[PDB]
């Protein structure tokens, strides 16, 4: 009875909360208090299989919490979040993901590269500055919008995708 622990990062005002909310709850929220780090749940077939999703949707904030810390030591798999409109949320996805390999002791994390908002025509980092930092990485990139809905899901099973070759 898999459930995969999914965990969001990034930096503030880049859409963690609406693409988790978008996700689970299939609406836009048009705001969300950044303050508000909480767990996610949901049932979801992917690829034909059911699993149970518990995404914790950080919100990077010197307030205290078990569930940010039982979560981010093991969440098996990280989305790394910026927004194509947002030149510092993608000059940020370097620290981020140093964190994640500290908090895991390991190179070799489940991960994913979002960037989000791609319904905004006021984009300034583009698709191939993206799609080199994700190879360099070692990972899978995905434009996402949610506000559209455009690659919300794939997004995030993509994610569970990766966890399960990592299983391996
Ligand atoms: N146009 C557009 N706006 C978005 C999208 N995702 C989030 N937003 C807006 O960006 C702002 C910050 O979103 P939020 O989820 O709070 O970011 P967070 O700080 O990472 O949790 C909110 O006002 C959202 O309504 C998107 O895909 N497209
Ligand atoms: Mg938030």
Known sequence: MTEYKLVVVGAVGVGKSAL?????????????????????????????????????????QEEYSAMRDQYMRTGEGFLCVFAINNTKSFEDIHHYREQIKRVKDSEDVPMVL??????????????????????????????????????????????????????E
């Open 20 to 60: 988790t909310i978008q996700l689970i709850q299939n609406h836009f929220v048009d705001e969300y208090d950044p303050t508000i780090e909480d767990s996610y749940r949901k049932q979801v077939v992917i690829d034909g299989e059911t699993c149970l999703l518990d995404i914790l949707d950080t919100a990077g």
């Open 114 to 167: 979002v960037g989000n908002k791609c319904d905004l025509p006021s984009r300034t980092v583009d698709t191939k500055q993206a799609q080199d930092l994700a190879r360099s990485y070692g990972i899978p990139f995905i434009e996402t919008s949610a506000k559209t809905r455009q690659g919300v899901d794939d997004a995030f099973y993509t994610l569970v995708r990766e966890i399960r070759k990592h299983k």
